[PDB]
CSV table of C-alpha atoms and ligand atoms in Angstrom, one decimal:
chain,number,residue,atom,x,y,z
A,4,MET,CA,-137.8,50.5,-45.9
A,5,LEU,CA,-141.0,52.5,-45.4
A,6,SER,CA,-143.8,52.4,-48.1
A,7,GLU,CA,-144.5,55.4,-50.3
A,8,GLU,CA,-147.8,55.8,-48.5
A,9,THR,CA,-146.2,55.9,-45.1
A,10,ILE,CA,-143.7,58.4,-46.4
A,11,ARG,CA,-146.4,60.5,-47.8
A,12,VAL,CA,-148.2,60.5,-44.5
A,13,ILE,CA,-145.0,61.4,-42.6
A,14,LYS,CA,-144.4,64.3,-45.0
A,15,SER,CA,-147.9,65.5,-44.4
A,16,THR,CA,-147.1,66.0,-40.7
A,17,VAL,CA,-144.0,68.3,-41.3
A,18,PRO,CA,-146.1,71.5,-41.0
A,19,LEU,CA,-147.7,70.2,-37.8
A,20,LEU,CA,-144.3,69.4,-36.3
A,21,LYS,CA,-142.9,72.8,-37.2
A,22,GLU,CA,-145.7,74.5,-35.3
A,23,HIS,CA,-146.1,72.1,-32.4
A,24,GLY,CA,-142.9,70.1,-32.2
A,25,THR,CA,-141.5,71.5,-29.0
A,26,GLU,CA,-144.9,71.2,-27.3
A,27,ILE,CA,-144.9,67.5,-28.3
A,28,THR,CA,-141.3,66.8,-27.2
A,29,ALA,CA,-141.8,68.6,-23.9
A,30,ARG,CA,-144.9,66.5,-23.2
A,31,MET,CA,-143.0,63.4,-24.3
A,32,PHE,CA,-140.3,64.1,-21.6
A,33,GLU,CA,-143.0,64.7,-19.0
A,34,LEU,CA,-144.5,61.3,-19.7
A,35,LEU,CA,-141.1,59.6,-20.0
A,36,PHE,CA,-139.7,60.9,-16.7
A,37,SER,CA,-142.9,60.2,-14.8
A,38,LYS,CA,-143.6,56.7,-16.1
A,39,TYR,CA,-140.0,55.5,-16.4
A,40,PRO,CA,-138.1,57.6,-13.8
A,41,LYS,CA,-134.8,55.8,-14.4
A,42,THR,CA,-134.5,57.6,-17.8
A,43,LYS,CA,-134.0,60.9,-15.9
A,44,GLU,CA,-130.4,59.8,-15.1
A,45,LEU,CA,-129.6,59.4,-18.8
A,46,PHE,CA,-130.2,63.2,-19.4
A,47,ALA,CA,-128.9,64.6,-16.1
A,48,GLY,CA,-126.1,67.2,-16.7
A,49,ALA,CA,-126.7,67.1,-20.5
A,50,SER,CA,-127.1,70.2,-22.6
A,51,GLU,CA,-130.0,72.6,-22.3
A,52,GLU,CA,-133.1,72.8,-24.6
A,53,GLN,CA,-133.6,69.1,-25.0
A,54,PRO,CA,-137.2,69.5,-26.2
A,55,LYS,CA,-136.0,71.8,-28.9
A,56,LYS,CA,-133.2,69.5,-29.9
A,57,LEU,CA,-135.5,66.5,-30.3
A,58,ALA,CA,-138.2,68.5,-32.1
A,59,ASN,CA,-135.6,69.7,-34.7
A,60,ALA,CA,-134.4,66.2,-35.2
A,61,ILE,CA,-137.9,64.9,-35.7
A,62,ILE,CA,-138.7,67.7,-38.2
A,63,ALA,CA,-135.4,66.9,-40.1
A,64,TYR,CA,-136.2,63.2,-40.1
A,65,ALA,CA,-139.7,63.8,-41.5
A,66,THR,CA,-138.4,66.2,-44.1
A,67,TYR,CA,-135.7,63.8,-45.3
A,68,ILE,CA,-137.4,60.5,-44.6
A,69,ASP,CA,-137.4,59.8,-48.4
A,70,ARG,CA,-133.7,61.0,-48.7
A,71,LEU,CA,-132.0,59.5,-45.6
A,72,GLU,CA,-128.5,59.9,-47.0
A,73,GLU,CA,-129.0,63.6,-46.3
A,74,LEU,CA,-129.1,62.7,-42.6
A,75,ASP,CA,-125.9,60.6,-42.5
A,76,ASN,CA,-124.0,63.2,-40.4
A,77,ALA,CA,-127.0,63.9,-38.2
A,78,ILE,CA,-127.6,60.3,-37.4
A,79,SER,CA,-123.9,59.6,-36.7
A,80,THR,CA,-124.0,62.6,-34.3
A,81,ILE,CA,-127.1,61.2,-32.5
A,82,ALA,CA,-125.5,57.7,-32.2
A,83,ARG,CA,-122.3,59.2,-30.6
A,84,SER,CA,-124.3,61.2,-28.1
A,85,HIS,CA,-126.4,58.1,-27.3
A,86,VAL,CA,-123.3,56.0,-26.7
A,87,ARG,CA,-121.8,58.7,-24.4
A,88,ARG,CA,-124.9,58.4,-22.2
A,89,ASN,CA,-125.3,54.6,-22.4
A,90,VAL,CA,-128.5,54.6,-24.4
A,91,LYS,CA,-129.5,51.0,-25.0
A,92,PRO,CA,-132.0,49.2,-27.3
A,93,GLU,CA,-134.4,48.6,-24.4
A,94,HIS,CA,-134.8,52.3,-24.0
A,95,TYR,CA,-136.2,52.9,-27.5
A,96,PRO,CA,-139.8,51.5,-26.9
A,97,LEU,CA,-140.1,53.8,-23.8
A,98,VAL,CA,-139.5,57.0,-25.8
A,99,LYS,CA,-141.7,55.6,-28.6
A,100,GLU,CA,-144.7,55.1,-26.2
A,101,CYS,CA,-144.3,58.6,-24.8
A,102,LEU,CA,-143.7,60.3,-28.1
A,103,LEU,CA,-146.7,58.7,-29.8
A,104,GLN,CA,-148.9,59.6,-26.8
A,105,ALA,CA,-147.6,63.2,-27.0
A,106,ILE,CA,-148.4,63.3,-30.7
A,107,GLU,CA,-151.9,62.0,-30.1
A,108,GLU,CA,-152.5,64.5,-27.2
A,109,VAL,CA,-151.1,67.6,-28.9
A,110,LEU,CA,-152.0,67.0,-32.6
A,111,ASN,CA,-154.8,64.4,-32.3
A,112,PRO,CA,-154.0,63.6,-36.0
A,113,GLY,CA,-155.8,60.3,-36.5
A,114,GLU,CA,-154.8,56.7,-36.5
A,115,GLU,CA,-153.2,56.8,-40.0
A,116,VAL,CA,-150.7,59.5,-38.8
A,117,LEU,CA,-150.0,57.6,-35.5
A,118,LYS,CA,-149.4,54.3,-37.4
A,119,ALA,CA,-147.1,56.1,-39.8
A,120,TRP,CA,-145.0,57.7,-37.0
A,121,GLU,CA,-144.8,54.3,-35.2
A,122,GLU,CA,-143.3,52.8,-38.4
A,123,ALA,CA,-141.0,55.8,-38.9
A,124,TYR,CA,-139.9,55.8,-35.3
A,125,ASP,CA,-139.1,52.1,-35.4
A,126,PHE,CA,-137.1,52.5,-38.7
A,127,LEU,CA,-134.9,55.3,-37.2
A,128,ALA,CA,-134.6,53.4,-33.9
A,129,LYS,CA,-133.3,50.3,-35.7
A,130,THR,CA,-130.9,52.5,-37.7
A,131,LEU,CA,-129.5,54.2,-34.5
A,132,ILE,CA,-129.3,50.9,-32.5
A,133,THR,CA,-127.3,49.2,-35.2
A,134,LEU,CA,-124.8,52.1,-35.4
A,135,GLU,CA,-124.6,52.4,-31.6
A,136,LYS,CA,-123.9,48.6,-31.3
A,137,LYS,CA,-120.9,49.1,-33.5
A,138,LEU,CA,-119.7,52.2,-31.5
A,139,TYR,CA,-120.1,50.3,-28.3
A,140,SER,CA,-117.5,47.9,-29.7
A,141,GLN,CA,-115.0,50.6,-30.6
A,142,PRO,CA,-111.9,51.7,-28.5
B,1,HEM,C1,-135.6,57.4,-32.8
B,1,HEM,C2,-135.4,57.7,-31.5
B,1,HEM,C3,-134.5,58.9,-31.0
B,1,HEM,C4,-134.1,60.0,-31.6
B,1,HEM,C5,-134.6,60.5,-33.0
B,1,HEM,C6,-133.2,60.7,-30.8
B,1,HEM,C7,-132.6,61.9,-31.0
B,1,HEM,C8,-131.6,62.5,-30.3
B,1,HEM,C9,-130.9,63.7,-30.6
B,1,HEM,C10,-131.2,64.7,-31.8
B,1,HEM,C11,-130.0,63.9,-29.7
B,1,HEM,C12,-129.0,65.1,-29.6
B,1,HEM,C13,-127.8,64.8,-30.4
B,1,HEM,C14,-126.9,65.9,-30.4
B,1,HEM,O1,-127.3,67.1,-30.6
B,1,HEM,O2,-125.7,65.7,-30.1
B,1,HEM,C15,-130.1,62.8,-28.7
B,1,HEM,C16,-129.3,62.7,-27.6
B,1,HEM,C17,-129.7,61.9,-26.5
B,1,HEM,N1,-130.7,61.0,-26.5
B,1,HEM,FE1,-131.8,60.5,-28.1
B,1,HEM,N2,-133.0,60.0,-29.6
B,1,HEM,C18,-133.8,58.8,-29.7
B,1,HEM,C19,-133.9,57.8,-28.8
B,1,HEM,C20,-133.4,58.0,-27.5
B,1,HEM,C21,-133.8,57.2,-26.4
B,1,HEM,C22,-134.7,55.9,-26.5
B,1,HEM,C23,-133.2,57.6,-25.3
B,1,HEM,C24,-133.2,57.1,-23.8
B,1,HEM,C25,-134.3,56.8,-23.2
B,1,HEM,C26,-132.4,58.8,-25.7
B,1,HEM,C27,-131.7,59.5,-24.8
B,1,HEM,C28,-130.8,60.5,-25.3
B,1,HEM,C29,-129.7,61.1,-24.5
B,1,HEM,C30,-129.4,60.7,-23.0
B,1,HEM,C31,-129.0,61.9,-25.2
B,1,HEM,C32,-127.8,62.8,-24.9
B,1,HEM,C33,-128.3,64.2,-24.6
B,1,HEM,C34,-127.2,65.2,-24.7
B,1,HEM,O3,-126.0,64.8,-24.7
B,1,HEM,O4,-127.5,66.5,-24.7
B,1,HEM,N3,-132.6,59.0,-27.0
B,1,HEM,N4,-131.1,62.0,-29.1
């Protein structure tokens, strides 16, 4: 799991994400769809307000990163939505690149924050991928 210092740094970004989260995720999508245009098809026809939905999930993750059992239901819900749109492990570094770049552009929070969010993203990605692997096996 993440170190206490990484957790402390993640918690310190919660106010920034509450103020700027949707700006960050909208920029993430702009970078993702431009650099990796095949990802557009994963989201076509899905629900509205994707930047808001991701920003809320990131804020909740940062808030409960030290209490992840509180996110059991939310993480299960994400995994099921991912499986319905054929999200695969190979996609996760694409969103990571674009999300960390958006965080740097919009918040310019320094290398300590960006390293912490890289670790936090990777932890949640591995969690989701593992759950999704199981769901991909389920009738
Ligand atoms: C740690 C990384 C990620 C997080 C925190 C995350 C978060 C979310 C959330 C909160 C939802 C909406 C769940 C719901 O309300 O039902 C979602 C759905 C979705 N995500 Fe992710 N996601 C991640 C990685 C990815 C990646 C790498 C891709 C593909 C490049 C992706 C593509 C999608 C798609 C296509 C949907 C379905 C949208 C919909 O049904 O409205 N996600 N994800």
